Amino acid sequence: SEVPQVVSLDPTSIPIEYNTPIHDIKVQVYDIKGGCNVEEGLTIFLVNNPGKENGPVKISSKVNDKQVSEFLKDENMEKFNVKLGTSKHFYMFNDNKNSVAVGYVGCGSVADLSEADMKRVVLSLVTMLHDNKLSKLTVVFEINVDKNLFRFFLETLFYEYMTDERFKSTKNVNMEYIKHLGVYINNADTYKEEVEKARVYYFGTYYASQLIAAPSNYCNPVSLSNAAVELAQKLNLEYKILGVKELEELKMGAYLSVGKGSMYPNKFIHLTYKSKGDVKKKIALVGKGITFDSGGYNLKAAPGSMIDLMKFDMSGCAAVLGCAYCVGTLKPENVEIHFLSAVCENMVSKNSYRPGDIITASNGKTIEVGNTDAEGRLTLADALVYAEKLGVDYIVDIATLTGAMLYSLGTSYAGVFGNNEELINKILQSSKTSNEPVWWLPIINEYRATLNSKYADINQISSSVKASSIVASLFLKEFVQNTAWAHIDIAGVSWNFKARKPKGFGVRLLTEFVLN
Amino acid sequence: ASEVPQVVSLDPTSIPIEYNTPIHDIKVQVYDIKGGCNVEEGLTIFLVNNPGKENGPVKISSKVNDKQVSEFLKDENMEKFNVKLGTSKHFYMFNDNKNSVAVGYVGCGSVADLSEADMKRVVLSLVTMLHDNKLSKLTVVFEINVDKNLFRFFLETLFYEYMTDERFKSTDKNVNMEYIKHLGVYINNADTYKEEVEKARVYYFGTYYASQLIAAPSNYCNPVSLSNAAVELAQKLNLEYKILGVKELEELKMGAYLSVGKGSMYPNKFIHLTYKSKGDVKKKIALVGKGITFDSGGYNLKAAPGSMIDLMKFDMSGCAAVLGCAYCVGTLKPENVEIHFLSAVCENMVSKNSYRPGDIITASNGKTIEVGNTDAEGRLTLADALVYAEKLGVDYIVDIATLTGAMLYSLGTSYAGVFGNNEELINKILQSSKTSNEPVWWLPIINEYRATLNSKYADINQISSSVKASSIVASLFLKEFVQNTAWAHIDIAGVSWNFKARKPKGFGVRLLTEFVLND
Amino acid sequence: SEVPQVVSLDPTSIPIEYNTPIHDIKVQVYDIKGGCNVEEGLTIFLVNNPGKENGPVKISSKVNDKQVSEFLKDENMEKFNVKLGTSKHFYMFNDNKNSVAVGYVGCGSVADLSEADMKRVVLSLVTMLHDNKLSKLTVVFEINVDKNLFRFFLETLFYEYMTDERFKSTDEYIKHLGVYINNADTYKEEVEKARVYYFGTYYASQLIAAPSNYCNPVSLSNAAVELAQKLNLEYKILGVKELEELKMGAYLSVGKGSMYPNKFIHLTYKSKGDVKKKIALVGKGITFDSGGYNLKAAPGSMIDLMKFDMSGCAAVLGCAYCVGTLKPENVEIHFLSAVCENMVSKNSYRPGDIITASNGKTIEVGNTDAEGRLTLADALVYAEKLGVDYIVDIATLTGAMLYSLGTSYAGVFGNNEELINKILQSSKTSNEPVWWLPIINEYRATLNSKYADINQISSSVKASSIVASLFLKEFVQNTAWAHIDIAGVSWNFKARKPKGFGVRLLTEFVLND
């Protein structure tokens, strides 16, 4: 619980903002079928034109104001375009002779907007929200969206609108979030239930983002495990933090070896949510929790190794904890979930484990270490045997495991591997409804022979096959004996290089998996 | 003084320093050339040139008070030799008293005004004549034109190159070393040049002292032993001194400086030396030196080709330059001036305790900094040092540092770069460069690159991820930690080490001293 | 004249747009004291705020329209801030019930805007123009700018507004520009000069942006001829046969491995009347630099960008446009470029080759990727024989510039301080930033060849830019000479296009001399 320090100026906890300005936004959903009121703040119409390429803007909605409706008549609007991401602002006086601000955002010419399409619309919308001191925003849906896409709109809106200023000291003086958000859409009553779900999904994602973005001197195994406890306490999760003494008794030799060279003791996070009624499904969610990945003696010194980004290497853990918030808040029924993460730090030291070392996992398997920079699968290995010992139905691990993902699926799609096709399908189904894209990749058994060690039971890495993501999955597969298991590699999708911030990828995905 | 920690008992606990050098035992005499030259014992060398006559014949113009020697040096005899820069010859003959004497010359080219580099070549050629000859006396006859500043440069360079560092020699000591005991100089209007002699001797040792600190390996020269050397120096010079330990640095919240040293076995030591004039103080100056006793690069380890990790003892050259300046100032004792000699000394190592890439740290002025590269640790330590410097309420802040390797690609190994926020201060540094003959060139602080230091989470980035103009970006960083004081920054990463001669130059000592003295 | 082809689909000329939509824009300048009228198009206020948080926007100028004045009231504008580059624009109806667009661009908190700052202002302004079907743009200057910066504003505006679609197959611009500024009469003379400076820069941009299959030594020399003919300049293109007779072995060696014959461009401008200054402007004209057998294969060598390596030539030709159009007095200008291509072939020159320059000096080649200085050597020998007063060469010579001054400031080297100062003065008034770097003679000894008269490159001295300058200096014996290294500033990496750097710089140099 106590964070060790080298000097007194080293931080001893991760700063966390629980009550965000987003939570102070009062959200109202009205049916468009009744007309729109255009009074205070900024009013934005989401408009398209199906199959007209860059077509003219047409406002279909009834506006309960003669002046505003006159301004928005077709003859006036035809000079404007519906190009995806395009936005404009209008100034006018209403019927009550008050000054009002109105505008629109183009949603293209395709009837069914994709996640990327919706993201671009929101990003354009957020641009209108920044550098304008508005008190209220009104969004009018003149496009077709189902409830899942509507929820995604809000989640993305909240997430992109929110700005992390925890580490700013000498800060934007003009930041001023809206206090009211009005939404006009048809059949408002079906969409109202998605509002609070979006708000929960937002913070779950933003919470994971805060943990990832937090630098390694702030976010260490002790401080992160402490944060998990604080989170568990607020949400009523049973919690248990395993220290070195417990881990040694449990013989987690693979996991403990990675943390040897660190000044922070290893901390194993175990949170549990149990429904009050009959439990029909038991699920273990495992997250990779490397607070910093230096590579060990296989130091990240090669070009393109992105060593300065390696605080992100606990993204899997953050996603699991972010999911814990959503589950703890929405309180699903007939399910018991274990939230696991073997947290440690991979550093260079006189105490560090060396390339060539043979270590023993808690399942008795001896492992020959060929590369200390492949430490993720080592910690995940012991975490998986622990998971299976819990007697669950599904084991789902999520991790920034291999850089090869950047070459396979890139920065938008995560890879999923597994030993069970139905479980994979459930993950794929969750991906669609959560709108966090995942693609099914194969575990090619032909590469297994490349993990055959001369002295230990198995090699940590291959010295042949360059398909590291598959090889790593083959390694993890050896530590799940008789349980449905899936592995999501998020090394490529976790960090937003363009926006220079985390995505909090996986939070909404894991929650949809649990809920449905 | 603090106790130097050891891993084994064989680890050195102090930097060996030679204060009394053979140069200090040399008696220097300056004569007027119009009185004629006496050629008796030891070696007598004529410095000769030939104006616009590309390798011209040698001609001795000076009167020699010896019939035999004057006949030997007559034009007819000397025309077989030429004045090519760096050329030297030895002559053997008998004088009027039937004694054997040794005479020679060094070619000074065909250009009337010799540059520092040219003069250096002349001196180097001269030193070769001193080497491997057991001489007791050297006599140098100036048949060329040099001003007082260039004349002093000759003596300083002569003393520096003649001197040999044998502190770390044990079984391979040179059995044949035997320095001259007397140095004679014949020059026109000598009375004007006499004041430069002792000044040269002072400037020499300041440079040689800095050289000794730099050349000292990192196991000998650590933050503790270097700060101890600073204290010992201050005591000898009657300067006020103050060494800040970790506890005091924490109270001052010097987080950037402390973060770099976290991974070291040697505690951070902040050097603060003070020279105060006895009279009314009219100018207050802070001299800040980068003091990284060893730069491994941190977790951004120097593992790339050309990173020169074996040279990284040099990375405290700025501190050494500052301490060498403290010697000169404390010795010549300029008045009506108050000088602060500062250096945030530490070591950048790889450890479980080391600071990581991506860490956000807080400087003593409250600015939060995101670390993108641990091998850019110099600017982190300088940041807190500059904030400390400005709190002293000085008129000028001048920092000197082996900051960026880009200097090797911009100005190279001969000229140092100077950046600043004040043009008058910059001109003064340039003025000091001319009179000290330590080359400096003005480089710009381009404000357009500033936006690349905008961090998403912290107040500022330590490094840029685009620009690649490392020296300018670093200056932009440091500028953020000097709020309202005239400040200049001298990057000596390229000029500090003499790669051809395999030794330090002690660059900056004479430059900084000239700056203080002529102010 | 005839461009050789490998296949019939290979282009045989560089497409050039001479008449741009920018030339069709009518520009009117009014005095701010008379008030602003808001009728057609888009109206943008350029505003600042000394000591700005960044602080709120406040419009001081009087607007002769009740509807617009209601919009521009302090209470409404306080919601916006003046942070540099920030902009907002709204659409509304004026007193005459016409649709109008009104807005602002934030100019920060500094009273005196820099070259870099003004560019950020312009880009934000241009961003609104690319996404609004406007007929007229009106700019209201509520900031202080001198005559030079105002001209710079227009040049940058015109240049960034213009879009190159020459190579877009398939698989709008405003017609009026209104300017409100204090002391309007003083700024009116700057308008047409800016339009000239614009195209000079944009013309150079077109040559640089043109790919190596379009822009080759033959097609580039042809383009120079066509330009000279339109400007009524005397022109002369030296071919291989003439070059051999002139014994330009260094220049000819670089082009040996190319399928395109070497072409030496020589344009000349003579002022009507007494000539008081004679100047030769030399531009590096490598249409493509593969590096030769010292192939650009190392990481970060950016071989896909190497069409840019004739930027120096383009800058000189762009200058030829400006000088030929504005027609300065008392001056004679020579526009020179030894154009060729550096390729890998059985006919290519090899590392280790010893070649003879036209001045008789033998050169040992240590790196075929340092071909720029070799071509410049013969060009400099050619230039001095013309008997000029100043020789100024401009070249993308060394990548080391990216490590010294970066992408914003070019480096200038020289043997004459008066010439250097004139360049620096020209840099200030043209707002194309240049910084004086030294030619350190101590490094000269590293060019001493064991067998030849001189080495092409150094064997260490990582100060490549200075060493190269030391090389070129050996080919100017008795003339005031300057060298501008634009390797770092030539290409705009963020915008993915050329800057046309040097055109305005060279013209100001000629004009103010």
Ligand SMILES: CC(C)(C)OC(=O)N[C@@H](C(=O)NO)c1ccc(Br)cc1
């Ligand atoms: C097997 C091999 C030797 C290639 O090592 C890696 O697979 N490195 C990954 C790692 O260091 N895991 O801990 C990694 C690299 C980049 C990114 Br982004 C993520 C993960």
Ligand SMILES: CC(C)(C)OC(=O)N[C@@H](C(=O)NO)c1ccc(Br)cc1
């Ligand atoms: C910003 C960057 C990542 C390039 O890091 C450097 O600037 N390196 C310098 C350094 O390590 N300072 O601490 C340095 C290298 C070599 C020489 Br020689 C001098 C100084």
Ligand SMILES: CC(C)(C)OC(=O)N[C@@H](C(=O)NO)c1ccc(Br)cc1
């Ligand atoms: C050090 C060396 C002698 C090889 O010189 C180069 O660095 N090459 C330049 C070149 O290829 N001249 O022809 C160059 C490279 C990149 C850029 Br950008 C500009 C110029």
Ligand SMILES: [Zn+2]
């Ligand atoms: Zn790793």
Ligand SMILES: [Zn+2]
């Ligand atoms: Zn990892």
Ligand SMILES: [Zn+2]
């Ligand atoms: Zn370093």
Ligand SMILES: [Zn+2]
């Ligand atoms: Zn350093």
Ligand SMILES: [Zn+2]
């Ligand atoms: Zn080249």
Ligand SMILES: [Zn+2]
């Ligand atoms: Zn080139």
